[PDB]
Amino acid sequence: VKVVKNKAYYKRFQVKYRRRREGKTDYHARRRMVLQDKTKFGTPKYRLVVRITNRDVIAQIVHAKVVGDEVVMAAYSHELPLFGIEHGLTNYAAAYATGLLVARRMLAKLGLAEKFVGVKEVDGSYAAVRTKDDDQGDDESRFPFKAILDVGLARTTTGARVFGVLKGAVDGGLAVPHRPNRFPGYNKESDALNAKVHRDRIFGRHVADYLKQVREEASSDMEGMYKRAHAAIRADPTKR
């Protein structure tokens, strides 16, 4: 048969980008995420990079540069046991916790704490955060820190843990533009978000029900510690 991969094939071959070969970067989306108005002469633009592995949740704030991307702040799921969560570390509740940590640490670094404290009581309702592009009729007050969500190659479905990290960052004080169309409680028929269903997922009621069912299957608490964890992060986010 005709043999492909001869000498002529290798001479004419053009290799793709290194990170495209490794299957790590979508350069079609990355080009739009870094693009900025030329009338803004190089003013900083930040990204919120969220990557979830088989055993970890990673949240980073990244500023793109020609020499190489620069990471301003990073939070990981394995630092949660220092705050009070020693199980899960991958579930939706851990996604919320790490989003709060990265938002709290970044505001602490900038000195912008004790302002833009976010919400104190946790609820699943929509926020409609304030940005320069679309503000809520107010221009006198100081604007919050802004970043745009970067989910990478993950498939963006309703009630995914990537959008869990987004909610935690918004509740922590960051201004990441978004819509509630992808939150767990959102129903597309009525275009309404069940804040009750959302609130349970943040506090891990779905995990508790499955654990209780599993205990029953073997035969023949979580909400309280999550609340304590949220308080601990909001108190001393720089501990390590």
Partner 1 sequence: VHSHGYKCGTRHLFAKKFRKHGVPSVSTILTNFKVGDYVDVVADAAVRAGMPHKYYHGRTGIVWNVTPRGVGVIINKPVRNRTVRKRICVRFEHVRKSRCQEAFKQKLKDLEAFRAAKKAKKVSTRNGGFVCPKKVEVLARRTADYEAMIP
Partner 2 sequence: ANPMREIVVKKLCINICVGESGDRLTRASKVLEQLCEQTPVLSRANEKIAVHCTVRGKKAEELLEKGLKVKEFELKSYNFSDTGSFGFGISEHIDLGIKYDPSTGIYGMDFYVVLGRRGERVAHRKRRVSRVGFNHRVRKEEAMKWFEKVHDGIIF
Partner RNA sequence: AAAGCAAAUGAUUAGAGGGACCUAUUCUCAAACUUUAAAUGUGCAAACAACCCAGCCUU
Partner RNA sequence: GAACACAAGCGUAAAUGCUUGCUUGAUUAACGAUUUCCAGUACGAAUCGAGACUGCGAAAGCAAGGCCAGCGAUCCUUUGC
Partner RNA sequence: GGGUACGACCAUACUUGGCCGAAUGCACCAUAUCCCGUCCGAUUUGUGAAGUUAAGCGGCCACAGGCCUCGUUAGUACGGCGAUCAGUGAUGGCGCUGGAACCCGGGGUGUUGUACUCU
Footprint of partner 1 on 21-40 (CB under 8 A) = 30-31, 34-35, 37-39
**Measured from the CB atom, is 26 or 223 closer to partner 2?**
26
* Nearest residue to Mg ion, by Cβ distance, number only: 29
For 23-62, letters b (16+ CB in 10 Å) and e give eeeeeeeeeeeeeeeeeeeeeebbbbbbbbeeeebbbbbb
The yes or no reply on residue 231 touching RNA (CB under 7 A) is no
Burial, 165: exposed, middle or buried (Cβ in 10 Å; 0-12, 13-18, 19+)? Answer: buried
One of 46, 80, 83, 89 touching RNA (CB under 7 A): 89
Cα–Cα dist 144/46, whole Å = 13
Token pair of 169 as six digits: 């960052």
* Binding partner of 62, given RNA, Mg ion, partner 1, none, CB within 5-8 angstroms per partner class: RNA
Cα–Cα dist 221/192, whole Å = 29
Stretch that binds Mg ion, among 25-33, 42-50, 115-123, 128-136 (CB under 5 A): 25-33
Q: Which residue has the tokens 């918004």?
A: 170
If we measure between CA atoms, which residue out of 101, 177, 178 comes closest to residue 146? 177
198, 183 Cβ separation under 8 angstroms: yes
Binding mask 103-132 for RNA (x = CB under 7 A): ------------------------------
The yes or no reply on residue 227 touching partner 1 (CB under 8 A) is no
Cα–Cα dist 208/216, whole Å = 12
The yes or no reply on residue 65 touching partner 1 (CB under 8 A) is yes
Per CB under 8 A, contacts with partner 2 among 2-41 are 22-24
Cα–Cα dist 175/143, whole Å = 9
* Binding partner of 215, given RNA, Mg ion, partner 2, none, CB within 5-8 angstroms per partner class: none
One of 11, 12, 18, 155 touching partner 2 (CB under 8 A): 155
Nearest approach, Cβ of residue 23 and partner 1 (Å) = 18
174, 144 Cβ separation under 8 angstroms: yes
Per CB under 8 A, contacts with partner 1 among 156-185 are none
148, 22 Cβ separation under 8 angstroms: no
Per CB under 8 A, contacts with partner 2 among 207-236 are none
Per CB under 7 A, contacts with RNA among 29-58 are 29-30, 32-33, 35-37, 49, 51, 53-56, 58
Binding site for partner 1 (CB under 8 A): 12-14, 30-31, 34-35, 37-39, 41-42, 64-66
